[PDB]
Symmetry: C2
């Protein structure tokens, strides 16, 4: 194309979910109230499940695996050189895996954080000089975790600076200072009453005294303790100096928070999704950005439809339609014939998208992606879009060197019609 | 008078150069030659230096308003406010999101705050209020990752700040430390009152002596992690750790440390004491502006000298002018080396070129040796700049990487050196 990060689809398809929602019926209920209520109840059971565990579920073999084959260093660090043998060894020794699991207690994430493959915020890149394998693909980033997320704590490093914890959707190493310990009193009170869904990214949570507590993004849920015509008060978990959780009430606007679940309509979905439009891609939520699957999970959270964290798992949600063996144009035709706008996920290995309906005769999809795989002059590349966009099923059609003769469409295996 | 055959074979492994075999990566070797237990300054002079270190460190708590004028706060938001460079997706910064940073910064109200704080966890001063990066040219040598140009400097926990502004949403503060100012996440700062500051500045300070020193309460609660360059009040060695309460003010939690982890400041200035601390840094990866809580050339030297109470400013060029400066810029390379050998004071002399600064350690096999954390050797292949990356704290000659292919320059870092600075000033 002409300029960086552009393809013709971004002019053909409006980067505005409202256009597709108008066509779908902006105020149409995509699920009946009772069924959406059931879905929301399930969402809450999944979210708080770590608080009912009595031990961590991850076997030590899986905890040990990322420390390397015979513990040897993996890949490249932040200096674009192979990970230092001594510093790598020190990560493993401090992990104290001979004692795993050494902890069994319940907590809550008090600030946006991450689950890491090993207990460091320093990165690992498999191959800095190869397209798709250098920065920003920090392979130690398993997933971002939003503030307010219940965790079960199963292990700590010897120095106590890192914990190995389990959320409803993933497990990994997390900085200890991002977790507050919760007791029965706290948990009971926290789960009683209604919850609110955060409706805008980068929503600052400040106490009535002006103290800044944390920032919340779409996908975040907090207890709702009051609501007026334009205001909503939420309870924000905060870590006290002694390590336990307290709650601080925070006043937000009705533009920033609503009682969960928000009604599931294309118009309501478009309003939330448009807030993500153009957001940079972050592998496993690096930089508090989003990737293909965290985009979809966070988009559906305010409506109470639970999705797992990874793309391949999300594809197994709802009602599957296999399309793997079809010719590319037959695949697009089947998506068009059977896909349910705003409620269907389109899946290929390593990528997942939301189907929005037909736009000017082509299937349209919302997704946050990295790049189109290319080869030019005999060298592998990526044509990077790197952000949340609306495209066709073949966004890379115009890109020179596109490795997929039939694009992403050609690689698609199935559609997943929500909910299950 | 035949010039040297240019090197064409790369060193046997990535990140390696011949100097790393010629020079022991172990500061004790150079310390033992210098006199490991020999005191490098008279006591009273070191005491005066340490008193100055403390004066400077606590200066923000003596301010009544922030000293940074609004024009300096506004400038990094771009020429006519237009986006700068590339973001974490390696594409030009988004116009809308860029504008949102400026409009949320509420510069029309600057300075909106006037209060004193302390940094409770290792943090950073940023050019603009985001932890997302800016790269000037992702595809170009020295201009892509990991050179996040929004990273002004790391700030270690326990640092006094004066708070002069906040974003409209209160999530970011504009603050001034003793050595730098910039945007910092609000939750990394706890508010301090007169009573706190008085108790806090009273009594003795301890210097942390080991990187990655985990600070945990007696109850087992993890508080934060402290590195070399960190100083905290002394109550083994019980340090008073500042912690942010839910109401935003600082409290202190005592943390019991070993004599290996903390000592009363200042530690006596000897080559052996410097060698022990610097050996803790050896091999540590390079991070521009302290990215990842790593160190760069100048934060390396500042943090190394902190336990001894020798204040260094944050920027390399400023550190060069902190000591007695000897200009060597007009000398040819061999005469420069001879001058460093003749006038340089081992373990007390900084060697400066534009964009890099090192510590002179004395002579090793007839060559000036130096300790430094560097990124790369400048190379060129087919017209295009490259870098042969060492990217970590090393000991080398003044001309490391003459064995690197594509390094056409005969004179190395030495050739670019402008002067030496003999501490203390
Ligand atoms: Cl409608
Ligand atoms: Cl790439
Ligand atoms: Cl899940
Ligand atoms: Cl249409
Ligand atoms: Cl494509
Ligand atoms: Cl001695
Ligand atoms: Cl570079
Ligand atoms: Cl300074
Ligand atoms: Cl160089």
């Amino acid at each position: 194309p002409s300029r960086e990060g552009h393809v013709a689809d971004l002019d053909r398809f409006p980067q505005d979910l409202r256009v597709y929602a108008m066509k779908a019926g902006a105020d149409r209920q995509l699920l009946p109230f009772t069924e959406q209520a059931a879905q929301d109840a399930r969402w809450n059971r999944r979210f708080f499940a770590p608080w009912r565990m009595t031990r961590i579920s991850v076997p030590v073999k899986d905890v040990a695996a990322p420390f390397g084959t015979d513990g040897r260093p993996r890949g490249y660090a932040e200096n674009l050189l192979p990970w230092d043998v001594t510093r790598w060894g020190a990560l493993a020794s401090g992990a104290a895996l001979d004692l795993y699991p050494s902890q069994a207690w319940k907590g809550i994430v008090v600030s946006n954080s991450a689950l890491r493959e090993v207990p460091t915020l320093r990165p690992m890149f498999t191959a800095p000089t190869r397209a798709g394998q250098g920065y920003p693909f920090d392979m130690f980033q398993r997933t971002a975790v939003w503030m307010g997320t219940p965790v079960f704590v199963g292990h700590a490093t010897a120095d106590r600076a890192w914990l190995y914890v389990e959320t409803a959707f993933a497990a990994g190493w997390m900085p200890a200072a991002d977790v507050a310990r919760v007791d029965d009193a706290f948990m009971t009170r926290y789960e009683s009453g209604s919850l609110a869904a955060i409706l805008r990214d980068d929503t600052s949570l400040n106490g009535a005294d002006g103290t800044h507590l944390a920032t919340a993004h779409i996908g975040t849920v907090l207890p709702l303790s009051g609501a007026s015509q334009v205001g909503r008060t939420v309870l924000v978990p905060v870590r006290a100096p002694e390590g336990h959780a307290v709650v601080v009430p925070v006043l937000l606007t009705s533009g920033e928070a609503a009682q969960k679940p928000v009604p599931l309509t294309p118009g309501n979905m478009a309003e939330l999704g448009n807030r993500m439009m153009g957001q940079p891609y972050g592998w496993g939520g690096l930089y508090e950005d989003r990737d293909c699957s965290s985009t979809l999970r966070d988009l559906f959270t305010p409506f109470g439809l639970w999705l797992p964290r990874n793309s391949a798992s999300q594809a197994k949600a709802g009602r599957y339609v296999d399309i793997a063996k079809l010719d590319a144009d037959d695949k697009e035709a089947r998506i068009v014939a059977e896909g349910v706008p705003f409620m269907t996920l389109l899946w290929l290995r390593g990528h997942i998208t939301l189907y929005l309906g037909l736009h000017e005769g082509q299937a349209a999809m919302f997704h946050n992606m990295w790049g189109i795989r290319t080869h030019r002059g005999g060298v592998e590349g990526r044509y990077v879009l790197g952000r949340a966009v609306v495209t066709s099923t073949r966004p890379g059609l115009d890109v020179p060197g596109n490795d997929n003769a039939d694009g992403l469409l050609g690689r698609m295996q199935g559609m997943s019609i929500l909910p299950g």
